[model samples]
Structure formats: structure tokens, C-alpha cells
Target: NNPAARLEELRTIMKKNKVYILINSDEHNSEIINEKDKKIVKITNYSGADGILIVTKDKPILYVNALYELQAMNELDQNLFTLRISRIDNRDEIFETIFNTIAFDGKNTSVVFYEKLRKALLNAYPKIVEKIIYNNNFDDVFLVLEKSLVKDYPVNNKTLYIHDRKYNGACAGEKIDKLKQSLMYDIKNVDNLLLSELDEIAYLLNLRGYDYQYSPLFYSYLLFQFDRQDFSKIVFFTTVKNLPADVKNLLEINKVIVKEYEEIVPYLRDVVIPSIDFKKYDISLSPYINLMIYKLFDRKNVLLQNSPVVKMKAVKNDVEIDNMKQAHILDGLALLQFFHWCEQKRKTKELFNETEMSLRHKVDYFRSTKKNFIFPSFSTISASGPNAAVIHYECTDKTNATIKPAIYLLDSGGQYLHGTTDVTRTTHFGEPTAEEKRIYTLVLKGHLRLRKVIFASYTNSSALDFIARENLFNNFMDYNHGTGHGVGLTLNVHEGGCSIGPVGGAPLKKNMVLSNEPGYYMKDKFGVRIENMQYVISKEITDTTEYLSFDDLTMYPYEKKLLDFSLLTNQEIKELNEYHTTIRNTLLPLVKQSPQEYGESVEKYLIEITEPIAI
Candidate 1:
């Protein structure tokens, strides 16, 4: 794992290709340990998930957002890599024009990336892109150099068939028909649709796999062919040839033909594309596909439309919402037990030596004890006092801080078979200062304001995000990050296609699960963030036009001691009381029924904390 030596290997490849500079990203989105995008980690020793790595023949630079600034400094070898930061502050540029920062002297520059990483940049700056070469061989070369080889997907026996109507709500064939109907609305005639994004593939087929743990996605691609009349052929291309019979049995019912992963590109390049006449047919293509796949066909035969699965999956159906609610109740109880344990130690003054990683593991341990729990949704963010100020802080052996009587933020979740969860709660073991209490209340106020609003169907994400951030802006204080992104159902913790921030333009649709998190950070002092996973539903207001509002999909209590009544208005206080009432009604009975060592403590804490609050 000597990154210093790995850089030399990369240089040798660059020299062989006559490339003077190289650009790469660890933006595979789904991080599989077996097939990790270790190029950045191997080349620079920077391990944060979100960053762009650029290496010139002389100097190397990494571009990251504010969330990774402190982490980059601590982990990166400063002598070998220079660090720079760029954030998405503008509504237009989601990538923040990161490539704009690289000083291109028009030399032989090559971008070694999965086509997915190059999609936006190619669309954003098409003219200047002619100077760059897109190299697809670098990864295979590195895979051999790294010596961690897998000719195909490592045999996975855990893949499950979601055939039960209760779990999937609809069968794979039904979903395929519905999708073809959607494509027909745009293209009218013979159509073939390609599914590349893993979650999209999972949602469309109603099948779950374990290629990645946080997101129940398998490494596969699906293509469907529909004439004006019949859904004649469906091809499933995957590296995992040894799929279980249960999974294969369901695909067989859907009339899906399974093939090796390597066959997809050639199957399209030689068979499908060559068979199709551009004058007679139109094919479906999504803007989100990998650049390599995008280049496989003629532009004349393509009709560019965003994946219908992105919207279809975002809007959870009735059965899924019911399952999600059940998952939330148990998920909240797990966090409640975790907090009760920490507070008991705080009361006895025995919590000082507990490291951040220790507490992070504690919450995840609590989640595993519950029924239907698969794993932690993402890395648990457990930070005390100063560490909490780092927004998206990850605790490691060297940077781990001990617990203290100050602001402690625990942002964690669980991936249940029925649904998914992500929640954040910031508590203070000791008394908060006047300023601390005010900022906390402000964050809470913003969270509540966004939660209570009912908006017209025309509202996009940025408009809704402003509802959560207005109070912070009014106080001349704002968080650097967006309100939050979309959530998945037994999928990735951070879902894409829709987000409550500046860049995403998708309308907020009913049944879509999203997060409402607003915060303030004072570096080296403390940080405050309150997040709740919620879903949109139609509000039956007295009007002809449709309106939408959010319902709480996350059940958890806030820090009672940190609420400053002086800053809360009557309506704000009323909303807080009702929300607590809802939380109390939803979780107290479950807490009481659980037969555990700390059942009484957790139950008592839920009742006491969720008791009515007044201004």
C-alpha cells in the first residue's frame, strides 16, 4: 500500500500513452470493497470518498468540498499532494465547475475515469473537451498492478429474490411493462431501454443483491426491447454468473435472459445497434449513463430522457411507505437506547475516556439487535465538542476525541429489509451556553418550518430548501452544505436523481423520501445539526390545484436542554409540542414492549423527553 511507489507506476502508464496530465475520480457511487476504485487512494494516500484527483508529470492536486477539508489535511501526504477546495454554492453548477480549477496548458491531457464520472463535464464543456483523451485501459492496468484480481464478480450466495408482493409491492414484469409505457410516451414506437445505475436496476426488477452493503445493489446492467406491441426480449448482463436459483427463478418468470457482463457492450455494438434502422426506430437513453456506454450507439437513433426509474423509485408506493414507517419505529428505539447509555455514563462522570469510534460502534451495535436490520446505512458520524464542528466528520484512531460534557452529534442510520433510515441528533451532556442554545433553537426552528410547509406542485427542491434555511440566513448565519439529498428504500443512504438543494430541478413528488437537515458550525468550538427523514404526501387543502406536505418518516426526540424558549414563537412551540406528541405516541409502546437490559431506562427517557414543551 505504498502510495509513493504506486504514483511511479501511474507515471509509467502516462509515459507509455504520451499523456502529460491525468484526471480521475473515485465517483463510482457504489463502493464495493471487492471492486474498489483504489486509484486515488493508491496514488495519493487520500481516502475520503468524495474528491477529484489530478496528476501532472510534476505535481498532484486533489479537489474536495468543505466537508472533506479537515479530513484531507489530516490524511493526505502534504509533501506529495497539494490540496484545494471547491463547493457547490451556485444553483447552476452541481459539480461546481471543478475541472475549471485545473490549469490546462493544452498538453496531452487524458481523463482516466469510468464513463459516469465524465458525463457532466462532457455535457458542460463540449468544445474544450476535444483536447482530452478518454482512456479506458488505465483501470485494468492498475487492477493487474494492485494484484487483487477477480475475473468476474466474486461468487455471492446472499442474493435474495424479492418475490413476495408485500416487499416489492409489484412484480418485475409489471414494472417492466409500466416502464415501456413511459418510454412510449416519448418515443411512440419500437424502443429499447438500458439500465446502468445499480439502484435503478434494483428498483425496476424488484430484486435485491449484495454487491455493495450500504446500497442493496448488484453489479449488473439490464436492457429491455419493446416493439409497438410486445415486450419480446429482456437481457440481464451481470458478472455474478453463479446467482442463486431463487433469484434465477424469479427472472425466469419475467422471461429475462441472463448473460455474462462482458457481453453487453458487444451485444449492443454488434447485434442491437446493427439490427435497428435509424429511420424506423427510436431507442431510450438516460443522461446518467456511463460515457463509455453513451458512445456505443448513434445519436440519430437515441431519444435522450432522464431515467423513468429515478422518478418511479423516488415515489415509494403505499406498501413501501407502510414498511418504512414500521422500520422507523424500531430504528428510533435503537438510537434512544444508545443515548440513554451515553447519558447514564455522563451523569456518573464516567464517559470521558470513551473514544469517538467507541460511541460510533455503540449506535451501530444497537441497530443490529433489532429485527430485519441488515447493516448501518453509512458510517456513523459520532463527534463530541470540536469534532462535531467538522460537519461530515469521520472518526479514526489518530483523530478520535474523547467524550466530554459538550455538544455531541450522532448522525447514523440502519438499512432494514423493509425500508431504510438516516437520522441525526445533537445533544449536550452539560449545560449549553446562551449562544449554543440560541443556535440550536435556530436550527430546530428551520427544521420545523420546512417540515410544516404545504406547497403547490410547481415547487422545485431549491424553493423548498429555502424554507428550511430562511431563519439561519435571517440571523446572518448559514451552513455551507445543502438542506439534504433524497433517501432510498433499502437502497443507498444518499439517493440521487432528486435532492433538496440548488442544482436538482426535479419537482418534489408525492411519496418521495427526503431529509430535512439544517445546521450551524463554529470550528473548534461546537456544531449543531438536526435531521429527520421525511416523505411527501398530498395535502387536502380547499383548492383546485394540488399541494404537498411532508410527514415524519424518522421517529426521534431532540435535545430538551438545548431548546431556548426565548427564541421560539407560539406557533413554533405548538408545532414542537405536537411533533413530540407524535413521536411519543409512535415509539413509547414499542419501547415498553421490548425485553432488554435498558428497556425501562429507554422507555422512561422517551416519555419524559417527548412531554409537551411550551414557549
Candidate 2:
């Protein structure tokens, strides 16, 4: 009943365990910012509030990027500790510098970190820590929350589509076969293989479920074992009620035995013999699972590393890409209608009267009318004016802002049966200030710079992130979030495996769909962000060398009113105009063919806006 008392208990535990330094990684586990972070800052005297929080005996330090610099300076209690801003591009260097400076060698200065830290900061720090200090049981909160989110609904067996040679060169079965072949050697030694990641399970079995919100994943585990002496067996642990009759039959045919979710731990205790290959295991599993594995079973049986399914699913096939294109087209059309509706409301001075929550629903209403629209990929961030300044802001009844004559940020997305889409468009109904326009233009410049680059094959996302932020960085302004993240094909909207930003890893490969979002948030005022979904495709420049470039998949027009044309280069202006023309050509006919009430306003808006403007 009392979290305040729980905080004291944690403090006592920390002291008893002799944890000299504690780290909170936002990627794996972030403290409850609105609740826990304030308390931690006050208790630990830390200010640099965002990324990695390092707690020393005397004081704690937050190693964060430029985005949180202002927030750390003003919002944090400066009397507690110093607020330091580190370079986002050199996050590892900063992290190591701080770690070395504070946590090198002292009274058994045990540094606490999550299991995910090693893989996440791959090249950053210690490959293997010398002394494992205290493992926080509080981390079970993430696991419990993850498990609680599972609401499995029986899926229509006919709805699930497996890739075939007709659509793509490879099928899901073939992919699984290849995975099996690759694991045969390991399986010879290790008796079984365990899969815990949500997306990995979805991809391996050619199955999808509505267990998690936005993401088409079910809370499940697979215990796979191969036998040269007998038929290979795969035991699937999940709520069987979620499976349709046909789906159950299909799994049975595939030699997968269905079991209750509760049976996994006990089942592993009974059956798991010598070696177990956990090659693809990552932080997806709760630490409790790892504890169970080592405590009950032999720790030597485990093979821990980043999963192969991650990279495999990262690269989309031809079928997936084609489906994603269709999803984007549908999404683009819906956006056109929504924008048209917003403009109409603006003209009547009714826009400002609309609530942020209502506007989000209106956007949803537009997408809901489209074919194969599953649900929102994530909560629509329909923030207005001051609310936009808070990154990741969501509208509620009490906190909803009225849409007025100020910059409004709409970062929204939709999940179609085909693919997932995320886009952010910052617009203002009334005239914006000179400062607003300049910020918007700078953000746009960063966005276009990333989109319009040609890189060699196997280039990592960090290089692309630099291009995206160079313009804003030059202007001495930067956003808190990454420039882009990988998108999924009817999977998790924030799909991992590859990304684009200062901290991004993994090479940019062909057919990888990613979001290009560059933003600038003015605290207590407004936020400007321009986001588009783009995919990597090969570009032939030479006979010997392989080249790759982004092909913009999102077909939506940028707000012309917010742009300072004088600030754009001739080539940039040309790119903008060409992009508008493309949007017009692709979406105009669809808008024109709609019923009179819808098409009339949309056609007019599209025609007027798409016209190339002179500086």
C-alpha cells in the first residue's frame, strides 16, 4: 500500500548488498519518470536525467544526450548534483569515461547492470563483468507488466498468410527449415532450444496473435528439440484458448505440442537434460526465467547471445515489402482525408474548439474506414501547443489541450493486416511565428538529408543518424529521440533488429523498412517533427561496388505553410516539389473517386497545396 516504505526497503537492500554504483538503462528498464525518477533524483542527488543513471555512494549522475540538457538544467533540483550534457554521437565514450572515473576500483565497487546491457551497448564496455553484484528483483515489474499485457484472442486460421514461392523466392517453411539446419550442429550437443522473444515466436511458426497491444505477438515460449533417433518435437507454451480449431490442428500436424503457460517452468525442470542452446536468447525473458534455468537446470547448458531470428526478420522479403506498400497507400489516403478535414475545420474556426483526444479519434476514424485496418499501431499522440513540448505526450480527458493557433504535433500510426505505419506531422492552423518556421525548416532539412543519401552496402544506421541530425546539430538544437527505428510488416510497430540514430547498430540492409523522424521540441511551447516511412533498396552505381539508398514509402505532403523556402537549397527545393508532385499523382485519383462529401474538399486541398511554390 505504501511505495514510500518500499523505497526505504530497496535502500537497505542496496546497502546490505554493497552496490556502490547502480545503473538504470532506459532501453531495458527506465524508472517511472513522473513518479520514481523524481524520488531517485532527490534521494540519490542526480540531475542529468534521461539515458543511463549511475549512482555512486556520494552522488548519482545521469549520462544523457543534448535533448535532455535543458530539462536536466531547469526541472531537476540543482542543489542535489550537477547536470551534465554528453554528446549523443559519443555515448559509449561518455559512458565509459564516467564508469571509469567513478566505478573503477574502490571498496569492491560492484556495478549493477541488466543482462541486456552487454548486447545493447555491444562495443561499448566490459564483455564480461568480473564481479556480479546485486540483481534487482524490482526488474520483475517489467516482466510482470509484459506477461499481464497478454490478452490472446483466437485468430482466424485463414487470415494468417505464410510466404510462398509465388509471392517470394522463399516460404516460411523453408526459412524454418534453414533455421533448423543451422541449429542441427548445436542441437547435437545441446538437447533442446528455447525461444522467449515475442516476435521471434510469431515469425518461426508462421503465426500471429492479438495477445499484445499494437504488436501482433502472443505471450508464449517454444521448447524445440531435435532427434536423429526419433521425430523432432516442439512444445508451445501458451493459453490454448487463443488458438482456433484449425490452428491447433495445424500445429499438431507440424509436430508442435500445445501446453498451458503455467507448465513451462515445471516442464523444463522435469525434461531438460544436459545442454540447452539459447543462442537467440536476449533480454526478452525476465531475469526470473534465467534464475530458474540456472538454479533448477545446469547453468552450463545455456548458450546466451543475441537471437538469429532478430536479423532474419529484420530483412523483409518481397511479399512483405509488397504488402507494406499497399498498407502505406491505404494509410496515405486516410491521412489525405484527415488533413482535408482538419483544413476545413480550420477555415470555419472550428479547429481550435476541437479537443486533442477527439482529434486523435478522428484520425483513427479515417483509418478505421480503410480496408484491413487492424487497429492503431500505437496511441495517437495528438498534442497541441504546450502539450507537444512533452515528447511521448498522450491526450486524456483532464489533460487534453484545445487545438489552437499554435504548432500541433500529430504523431500517429495504424496497423493494417499487411504492414505497420508510423508518421508525425507538425502543423498549425493559424499563422506561426518566425521562430516556429525556422525550427520546422531545420527539422525538415535534417529529415531530407537522411532520406536523400546514397550509402555503400552494409552501412550501419549510425552513419544515417549523423546525416539526419547534422543540420539541427549545426543550428545548436537537437531532439531527444532517435531519428528513426525499424518498422514491422504486420508485427511490432517499433520492431527491433536495426535502427537509425546516434546509438543505432546493425547494418542498413535492403528491404529494411525504417521511420525517418527528426524533431525539435521547445519546452513549454511547441514541438516540430517530420516523419516518413522509408525502405532501403539497392542502387546500381558501379559494376563492382554495391550501393543502397532509401525509397520513401510514405506518400503524404509536408505542411507548406511551415516551410521557409528561402532556407532551402535549390536541390532541396526541387526534392520537395518532386515529392509533392508524387503525392499528388499517387493519391489524387483515389481522393477524386471518393463520395462527393469527402472527395470535394480533399481534391481542392490537394490541388491547391501540391502546386510548386516560388521562394
Candidate 3:
């Protein structure tokens, strides 16, 4: 009934617009889940596992690549959408898929798509597209109606754009310079380029600011002229107040010119040399801002390619990796402390009176003990039992559940000075039922299988995703989410371009840190997930082929009682034992080294929790 209603709603929209098909693929979590779109899209925050919904008169199909097929099938309303995999055997087949769905007769059928979709499809099938019909109000009809209502309109001056050298390792200016040099090397004849993504700008400038929630980002745009080899001639457009005096001086020293954020359009109109080979310049503007630029410049002139900073930022240096390790160490200790406290309460039968909200606060209290803890990487998903079945559940004072004899899933993370952390562990204060144990062990098996596998050094994330899901698929069960996502150093917990999921086509490179999370959820019953952070490193397996493997940075123990011995294979059992052994060896010394800081009794609790469980 719900699916039918949604389908009808979209049909009405299509009928009004005289549109044959409508498509939206904006996957940015922050962009897609704004106040208005949540009510429209329905699937608010499922992350990369979201599928592209296409509406036609008779056939409404939700097309997903292999990475999100299982997830979309499980979550989306089958009654409303005919699920279709958008896989292609070869490059030419991409266009075949499009033409098979919607025949092209130049202008017979009006197709509405976001700028990003237009760019992707056109790039793949440039010759097929005869003309484009630009609709300014398509977003309202398909995605979101407008910008978030009742915008706070906060004063830009209140935000601080500060240096992170004292806390995070200094930005690799020389490394970024090399990336820019290579970027221009391919298109040396291009005159100028525009970059709008906040992370790309922040990374290229080696700066950080508190302009957005959850990430240290300052809203800004960057324009660079490629007519010369010297990058110091670049111009950065942002509010004057967002750049402190020291930051201004640093930019000047680096040969970067600063201008008021509002003056960007005027400068492009008047200041830039009119005949300065505009055709030679290529720009890459975000789809969110691309249309605005079209409105400003009277037309769009930008290349739609992955930002150079994405791959560069995805691969970390030794210094950054070491700092991340330290961050995870502190994060792991905090987690151990919190779980230890929970264990004690459960053993003493004191946990029965607590609620989900109370446990959330307790976890926060433990994390607050760490130095340079800025904030949670994201809102803590502190859910218990039925609430845990809500994948991205948030606990509140009113809806908090009472702790009991069911599974508890705590998915949380913190942002420390060195790096960011994201982890999920489901445990129970009381004995879990046989069904609960089976599901829990299944999720753990998938997690361990992914973490323990070895792949060639340039293996794309799509192949690796299969390895992670193989265990779950064999059991005739699956989770409605991706296996893992890329983590950043003191940046957004969910970074992009590189990830360990079905949609992830980017090759796995050395020194990249990503989460290894596999989960299971039974609606209105219980949920289970096991997540750990791992960094990619080179493996010397064969002399002929370069290999890569994961080195675990998340040092924590799995719930011992939740394991069903008969369900595990010998290899899986061995992997679990080795993981527990590593946890005991790595964390026990650190706990003993600072017993007072972690409380004197933590060592004893850690020993018991980290003890290897015989399979």
C-alpha cells in the first residue's frame, strides 16, 4: 500500500511535467537528506547502498549496480519498483542499457536528470545525446524542493578557520603540488579550472575550518590558471572573516590571492582577461553548484571528472597513517573502558534498570577522557533490541529502551586530534537466544572473511565487496548496507572515491584506511553488526604480482557468548583466535601502562574480555 502511494505520487509528478523519465543520483548523504528531501526520497540515510530510482509511465524501475542490488532489494518496496541491476559487460553496453530503457528520438520523450547524471551518461554515450532540455525546477519535482527551510543564517565570522599542524600532521603541501602538476600535465593547454567541493579545497590549501557540522570544512571555491607552471597564481574566494590574519599571511606567502566570497562572479566577469583562452580552461564544478554557475556565466563550461584531490587524499602518507594508528589506539581504549563498564553492570545485574540513552551517555563519558576529542564523528547510534533493528537508529530521552535480555548494537565513533574513528559492536548483557547467536556469528564470519582476504594491489573495491558478502550470500542471508567505507584523517568519517563496497570501483591503494563492517537486522526483533578499521598495506606474497592486505587498527574484542561454535569453519575460528590474541597483546600493555587514567580495575576487565574463546 505504501509503495503504491509513492508510485502514484511520482506518476502525478511525471504527468504534470510531461516527462517520460526522471532520474536523480546525488549520493552525498548531507545533500540528499536535507529537511525537505527526506520526506520525498523516503530512504533517508542508507549511505552508498542507495539505488537510482527511475520513474516511467508503466514501468517504474529502481536500477542499482551490483554493490547496492542486495541492499535495495531488501529495503525498497518491491511492490512499487521492479529492481534492475545496471551492470554492463563492456563499455559499449552502458549505452545499450540506457537505450533499452528509454529510446532516443531526439525530442519525443522528455528525460529529466540531475547535472551529475547528465554528465555521467553523456560522457559514456556522447554521440547518442542529440539535445538537452534544461529544467530549472526539476529538483523540486524529483529530489528536493529547495534549500533547507529556516536556514540558521549563522554569521560566517563566528566560524574559526584554524591550522591543524599542532594536532593533525601538517598537510602535505609538496604532495598536493605534485598532484596539481600532474593534473595540468595531461591538459597543459587549458587556461583555468574551478573546484567547488569543500573537502577538495580544504585539502589542496592545507587548511581546516569549522564551517560545517561533523567536518572541519570551510565553504569556499578555488580557481586556478593552468597557463603557467607556478600554482602560486591561484585565487581562493571565501569570506574575509573566515580567513584569520595568520591564514591570510600564509596564503599570500604561498602566492595565493584571497577575495571576498561574493566577488567571485564579478571577478570572473571583469577581472579575468577576456581573450585569455577561455576554451583552454577546464572547470569541474559540483552538480549542486554547477547550475548556479550556469546562471552566473550564462552557460556551463566545466569538465565532469573525479577531483584530483580525491585519489591523493585517499592514499595517506606514513606520518598520517601513524597518527591514525594513535587515534585508533585512544579510540579503542575508550571503547574497552565503556564495554568493561557495561560488562561489570551486566554481571552484577545492574544493567537491567538502564536505558539506551543512559548507555549512550556512558560511552560519551569514556570517550571524553581522551585528549583532543573534538566531537563524535557522527551522532552515536546507540540502539538496543528492536531499536537496534533500525540501521541508523538514534536514541533519544523519550524513546530510549530499557536494557534487557536482547541484543544491543552500539554504532559510534569519535573525532580526536590525530584522526577519526568509526566502529560498531553488538553485544548483550544477558544470554542471547539461539537464533540471536546464529545471526551474530554469521555477521562476524562475513566481517572476518573480508578482513582476512588477500587481493592484488590495484584490486577495485567491487571485487573485494564480493569477498565480504560471500559468507552472507552462502548462508542465504544478507545485510542491507555496504561492507565498508573509507575513513579520513581528522575529516569526515565517510570519505568518498575509495571504499570497500559494491559501488566502489576505485582501486584499493596502499595506505588507505577503511572500515570493515558487516551487519544483520531482523525488523522489530534484533540486529547485529561488527565493524573494525583497517589500513591497506602492501603484501609481498609473490614477486610477479603486487599484492595488498589489511592490517587491523581497531583493537577490540568480539562478544564471546554470541559465537556458535558449530557454525564456524576451522579457518574462521583460527582468524577469530588470532584477532583476539592480537587485541590482548596490543591493548593489555597499553592499559597497564596507564592504569590510573583508565581506572585501576580496567586491566582485569580487559583481560577477561580479550580472553580467547575456544571454538
Candidate 4:
């Protein structure tokens, strides 16, 4: 830290410029420390001498509090006149400082400081300049070479790096185009305006590569219009801060005005920050409704394809999809290992509380090359025994249950680069009663029903709920929660629009993934929930016609100790057997070391579920 050299350079600049004014307060910048190049000054420091240069044209003056008099004289250049601080008219006081000091807004501060600084100069140097400065123009004058002080950069998926390698460079713009295309084919509806902020917008834009604590996603909104030239058009609103100059220029070239929220607001309606009328919706229930609405449409239509931001997310070209699929494959492996950890822990019959830390360890075990993660999708409901009865039970230090008899309900998910994953399984142990077995089997039935739905085009989630509820009708009393909901892409564990619920909005579409979880909760008794990842697919009926359908994505073998076969319907049993068969085929090779030892456990569970499948 060569302070003398740096100081001499700054002093030379100041002397050549003939500066005088300097100002700072008793906090943050006051009493700055100059351990060499890293210099220190009190309240304010004009190491660059800009303040002095601005003020010397008039009488050079340094303003300070009476308490700082002795200190200022010793440290400051003796040629500069130092004035003890005093306040006259609040308006006139700023003028009392230096006449023409060229000090920086030390913090590059806000509107208040801007106005105060402007007024101080005007009043103090009224007659010094040849002509009064008219226009209040604020511009950067120095050759500003500022390094990015903002520490948080976005971390991207390994797939992005793979793509960058494949193309010799990661063209975020190209990646964004593919996403936009995907959204166009999938998203059919739009709310008033799709207002997203920060990383969401960045994600949509494909301006990635920087380290993001989470996904390097950005947000924006879109609506339709036709120009007088008869051309269809769409508008995009995004923020422009922290972008490199080249990136900024590129956006400008594309007509993407990366402006402030205020600038974005005028173009689009304020659907983001809604005003509370003190009516309509209750705060407690609104978030619940927001969380539950996922049971409506698997979230295919509510996305923004036409939106500049969203369009970028939709069109994942073949290569990008392949890369993302690879990422998810790794993600699945990680998640499966976590499930393995849970299985091993459960066998110990130890107290397993569903704390964020407890489940996070499970998630961490299988973590892929993802930058970071959100909570286990939803709060991990590691409720054992009676605690399982609470539908949305979250274990606490005081209320965590022991892994005694009854069942264990674990619901958790992982946030990854290409996608997100959520799964829940409630397992029985130690010779469960018929009632527990019955409830667990019934919940599994609902899970399978949602996992294999077929729908005509444009069908909403209400249509799918029938499948989940069809199994519940026998009991007379059914679970109150939605059968399933849409999941966000590593953004929010719970997202809005399109779900398989009893009552909700929107229709389901292909490629939209929903969680097929249906469960039965007996208040103060116990709970059972079976869940799997449900991906919407198109079943080709004919050349011109096709049907939308769902496929369970979770491939891990289930624990046979919990399943009750007699409770399953013929069709329910058939689907369960097929799923087990798939799991057996997929996992047998992956986990097979000692056939009966390592793979056999999973194989035996599948065989039990199938009952009579030809091995």
C-alpha cells in the first residue's frame, strides 16, 4: 500500500487543478484510514483533490466541525483555508462551505444528497464563476475505471459450461432464444402482466456466465400489440444494472430498455405491487391460495412466451435440452442418493426431525454441479408417528417426533440448473395396523391416478383432480389439499397456475411438470402421502390428433414394508406394478452389486408391488 506515491499522484492532480473543497461526516467515510494506497480520512477525504479543484476558483475553504479543527490543520495542505463548520439558514449553510469545490458524492448517494450538494455549490459560489451554471447536468467526468464492488455474481449450471465448450463460447443470447421458443409452444395464457424481478429476468435474457448465488435468471413481462405498419409486436421490461457495457449496448441494439422499475411501470400496468384495499383476499390465505393454485393447470399456459424475457426461456433448442436433460440425469442420481441416506437413517429407528439442516444434508449428498439451491422445495415434513397427521407439518426442536411405530412422512425437493425436483413418501414400519396400511395404500392410489391422466386439448387442472379424488370417494372423507401443483424451474419451489386440484383455473399442456402427490391426513393421528414427478407428455393418437398425458419421473424403488396391496384397485395395482417394473429395470443395473443384497432390496419391493409380474 504505497500511500506516498499515490498521495503524490493525487496531490499533483489537485495542484494542477487548484482544488479546495472537501466534505464528509462523522460516520462511514469520516476518519478514513490510509494504510498506504488504502488511505484513511476522517468523515470525508478528498484524496483525489476534486473538491479542492472545484472550490479554489472562489476563496478555497475546507468545512469541518469545531471538534475536528486541530486534526484538520495537521493533516490538510497548509495552503488550503479551513473553515470551522457552522449552520446558518439550513438552506444557506451549504453555501457556507467552499465556493467551487469539486468533491464527489462520496457514496455516489441518493437524490437528497444530490440536491444538497447542488444547493451548497450555488449559494457558496454565486458570483465566482464568469456565468452562473444553468443546466443541472450530472455526468461522470473522470475516466471512471470502477471494478464491480457488488460481490454477488450468479453461478450457472454445468450445462451452461458444457454449451460454452461445445460452441467455443457460451452465447447466452442463443441459449435465451431457445428458452423463448419453448415458452411459445407451451405457454398459452397470460395474466394482466407477468412481472418478475432480478435473476428471473436475467434467466430469461440468457445474459448469464456471472456467479449468481442462485440461478442467473431475470424477469420481465409481455403483452400483444399491432403497429400502424400492421406488424405484430411485443414489449419487454428489464433492469440494466450490473451489465457490462458491451452487453448493455447489445440490449440497446435489440430495443430492450433496461431501465428502472419506474420506467417499466408506465409501459405496463402495476400488477406486481398490488395495492391492498383491506378487502378481497386475506393475507394468510392469499399465500396459501398462491401455493395451492398449482393444482390448476400444470403451469403450461401462464408462462410468458411472447414476453422478451420469457420467450428466451421457452425455446430450448435440441442441444440445450440435451444438456439440460443431462444435468437432470445427474440431479436424479444425487436425489436418489439422498433418498438412500434417508432410507439408511430410517432403518436405525432414530429420531429424524425434518429440520432444514437435517434434510439439507440429504440434499447435499447427491448435489450435482448446481451453483446453489432453495429449500427442500417445500419445508421438509419429516414427521414421524402422530406428527405426520398435520398436512403441512414442519418439525421444530421442541415438536420433532421420534421414529417410533406408525409412519414417517418426508416431503422434500432439490433446486438445480436445468430444472427442479420435489418428492414425498410416507413409509410404514414395525407391523403397522390395517388402518395405517389402508390410508397409505389409498394415498398411493391417488398418486398413481394423477401420474397417468389423459386429457383432450385445453383441459385445466380441475379435470385432473377427479383422478386423484376418484380413489378418495370410497372413504367419504377426503384430503382437503390439492392433489398436485406446478413447480418452478429452480426459481420457486411453489409456482402459480395450473394444477390438479379440486377447484382451480387453467388447462394442462405438454412438457409442463407437476407434482402428483395425494395424501390422507388423520388429525392428531397419523399422515400418509405418496408423491412422484409428473411430466406432461403428448400421446399421439393419430397424424392430426394427440392427447396430453403424464409420466412419473421418480425412478427410485419404494419400500415394501409400508404398501398395502388389498387396498389397491385392479387398475391402481396395474399402474403401481408398471411403475415398479420400470423402477426395477432402471435401478437394478445402477445399484446392483450383490443382487439380493444391494439391488435385491429394491427388486423385492418392486416384486411385492407387482405381486405376480413375470421376472
Query: In model 3, which range of ten residues has the least summed lDDT?
Result: 103-112
Best by lDDT: 1
- Estimate the Cα RMSD of every predicted model relative to the unseen true structure: 5.0, 7.5, 6.9, 18.9
What is candidate 2's lDDT per residue for 71-140, written digit by digit as tens? Answer: 4565555444445666645655543544222121111111123233334554555344332112333322
Task: Kindly report which residue pairs in candidate 2 clash with one another.
Answer: 280-307
Model 3, span 367-471: residue lDDT tens = 888977877777787888888777756565556789887798998888776888999999987778998998998888878877877888767887877777777
Clashes in each model (backbone N, CA, C under 3 Å)?
1, 1, 5, 67
Candidate 1 clash figure, as a count: 1
lDDT of 1 by residue, 253-317 (tens): 88899987768767987878876543544566655354445456554665556667877888888
TM-score of 3: 0.77
Pairs of residues at least 3 apart in sequence or in different chains that clash in candidate 1: 115-291
Off by over 4 Å in 1: 20-35, 89-157, 240-242, 277-283, 299-304
For lDDT, candidate 3 versus 4, the one ahead is 3
Name the better of 2 and 4 by TM-score. 2
Distance from true location, Cα of 263 in model 2, Å: 1.4
For residues 152-244, what per-residue lDDT tens digits would candidate 4 score against the true structure? Answer: 323322211211323112354554444344334543232222323333344444444323223333333332232223213334553334445
Give all candidates' CA lDDT scores. Answer: 0.73, 0.67, 0.67, 0.48
